[PDB]
């Protein structure tokens, strides 16, 4: 329950991974756009080879909430050293939200406009 300038993020600090009905370990991040503009967001991790992050580079309409599902690839297990990074920035009202528009946005957005929120993983 983290309240930021651009996004509210659930959970606020620590990710819990539970077993799904298929045996996989999955956790959920929910980003809620608390502004009046589209907010583009990226997810980065300290273990890029390890996690499926669906989605990892998207956008969120004003007042809407978007789910990010995170799971280690089969055979890998969550580790307490693993962290996650949410990067977010407001877009223009007119801009599109395809992969090409998002990629161009992240090249032009100034650094001091990009919110960042860090999350760690619970293990024991």
């Amino acid at each position: 329950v983290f309240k930021g300038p651009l996004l509210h993020i659930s959970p606020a600090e620590e990710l819990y991974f539970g077993s799904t009905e298929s045996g996989e370990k999955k956790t959920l991040i929910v980003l809620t756009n608390v502004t009046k503009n589209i907010v583009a967001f990226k997810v980065r991790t300290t273990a890029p080879e390890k996690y499926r992050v669906k989605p990892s580079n998207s956008s969120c309409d004003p007042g809407a909430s978007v789910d990010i599902v995170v799971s280690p690839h089969g055979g890998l297990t969550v580790s307490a050293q693993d962290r996650f990074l949410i990067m977010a920035a407001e877009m223009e009202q007119s801009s599109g939200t395809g992969p090409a528009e998002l990629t161009q946005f992240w090249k032009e957005v100034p650094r001091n406009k990009v919110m960042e929120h860090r999350l760690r993983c619970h293990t024991v």
Partner: peptide
């Protein structure tokens, strides 16, 4: 220290 995972868009 933070890296982009395999890209996944909407």
């Amino acid at each position: 220290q933070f890296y982009s995972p395999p890209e996944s868009f909407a």
